[PDB]
């Protein structure tokens, strides 16, 4: 199957540059185009430009000429985009997407690479339990969670029991605090009877600070 694997989230200072990558697999790299798209504030989509891997030629949205430079490494079937002279306006999620020579639109998209531009340094999160109690119990259901506090920049991902617990999980969008740091929580509802027997661990991934935290959450 077609897969487009992009590089992880980035933090960069204003004025700096970053190179992001898209490793393509499951198809013949040079038979298709590679496009790059910017999504700002989780909403507006803008087309940056494209490259035809067979010869490395590229075509740009003039708005992004000199902001973005597209290249490819045909050996590893990887496409790259360099973003130069970063400013806060460049903070966004960047997608690579496969196109065709036959008007097919963008038929497969990469996972997206968040880039945050800031003079502030990265900081990994503190993780605290949201412990189940009688005040988080109701008719044989209990809620528990973890509070993921004071990290920078976005994003953080959270799983429970290494992905084996998904039913009833809610992971909230982060809020930006007055301190300039983010926080979020992730909660799950589980059967009250399981609290004495079942282990619940939240797994918190913060790639920008190269940190992962596992936190066991217990009653009381």
């Amino acid at each position: 199957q077609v897969q487009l694997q992009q590089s992880g989230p980035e933090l960069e200072k204003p004025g700096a540059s970053v190179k992001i990558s898209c490793k393509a697999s499951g198809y013949s790299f040079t038979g298709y185009t590679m496009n790059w798209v910017k999504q700002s504030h989780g909403k507006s989509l803008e087309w940056i430009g494209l490259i035809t891997p067979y010869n490395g030629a590229s075509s740009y949205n003039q708005k992004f000429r000199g902001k973005a430079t597209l290249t490819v490494d045909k050996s590893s079937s990887t496409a790259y985009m360099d973003l130069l002279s970063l400013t806060s306006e460049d903070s966004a999620v960047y997608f690579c997407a496969r196109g065709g020579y036959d008007g097919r639109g963008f038929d497969y998209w990469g996972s997206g690479t968040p880039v945050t531009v800031s003079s502030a340094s990265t900081k990994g999160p503190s993780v605290f339990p949201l412990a189940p109690s009688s005040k988080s119990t109701s008719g044989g259901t209990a809620a528990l969670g973890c509070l993921v506090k004071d990290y920078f920049p976005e994003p953080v991902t959270v799983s429970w029991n290494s992905g084996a617990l998904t039913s009833g999980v809610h992971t909230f969008p982060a809020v930006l605090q007055s301190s300039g740091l983010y926080s979020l929580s992730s909660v799950v509802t589980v059967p009250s009877s399981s609290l004495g027997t079942q282990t619940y661990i939240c797994n918190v991934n913060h790639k920008p600070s190269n940190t992962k935290v596992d936190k066991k959450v217990e009653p009381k």
């Binding site: 639109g105 109690s133 969670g145 909660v187």
Partner: protein
């Protein structure tokens, strides 16, 4: 650049309803494409060349249009259709996308279940106390949380976050976090979050006594 204006910006539909969203272009185009994006995920090609469905796209979706006006229709909406839909043109350089139409799914009103969590001792050690109120699985999205500490209404010291609509039961959840200094937290006894909502005929209060 060709500007693509999508309407409505936000739509709310009951399951089983036919709905149509529109992409209006600032000049003529052809063979419009459409993408679906769910929260926290990458867009997927949905309809392309005006009316062709991508692999795996349900048959209730269709696309049509001509001139400067293109449309995406869902013949009978399902709960899983909640997403933002974007049109995209490739008639002139540069390629451009529409502003998006966000589709929300209607369901019967559901009042929230409310839970409250005191701060952990571990966090207190470090000088800060976060008290968390959870409103779980409610509809519609609008709800109101008030914090009271020893019966004094709190303002300016809480923040809320709301999940996107659940693709299976179409409900929302919300968290409200009250942040205090350790010293301020250890000054008071009773911590309460008071919740109101269209589907509650009187407020729901969850509370605890520090200790």
């Amino acid at each position: 650049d060709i500007e693509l204006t999508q309407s409505p910006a936000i739509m709310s539909a009951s399951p089983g309803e036919k709905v149509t969203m529109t992409c209006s272009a600032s000049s003529s185009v052809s063979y419009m494409h459409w993408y679906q994006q769910k929260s926290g995920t990458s867009p997927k090609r949905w309809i392309y060349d005006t009316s062709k469905l991508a692999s795996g796209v349900p048959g209730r979706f269709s696309g049509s249009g001509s001139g400067n006006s293109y449309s995406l229709t869902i013949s009978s909406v399902e709960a899983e259709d909640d997403a933002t839909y974007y049109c995209q043109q490739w008639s002139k350089h540069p390629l451009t996308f529409g502003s998006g139409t966000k589709v929300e799914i209607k369901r019967t009103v559901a009042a929230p279940s409310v839970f409250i969590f005191p701060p952990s001792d571990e966090q207190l050690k470090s000088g800060t106390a976060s008290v968390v109120c959870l409103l779980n699985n409610f509809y519609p999205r609008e709800a109101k949380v008030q914090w009271k500490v020893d019966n004094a209404l709190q303002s300016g010291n809480s923040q809320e976050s709301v999940t996107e609509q659940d693709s299976k039961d179409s409900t929302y959840s919300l968290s409200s976090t009250l942040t205090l200094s350790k010293a301020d937290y250890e000054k008071h006894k009773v911590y309460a979050c008071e919740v109101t909502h269209q589907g509650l005929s009187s407020p729901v209060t969850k509370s605890f006594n520090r200790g």
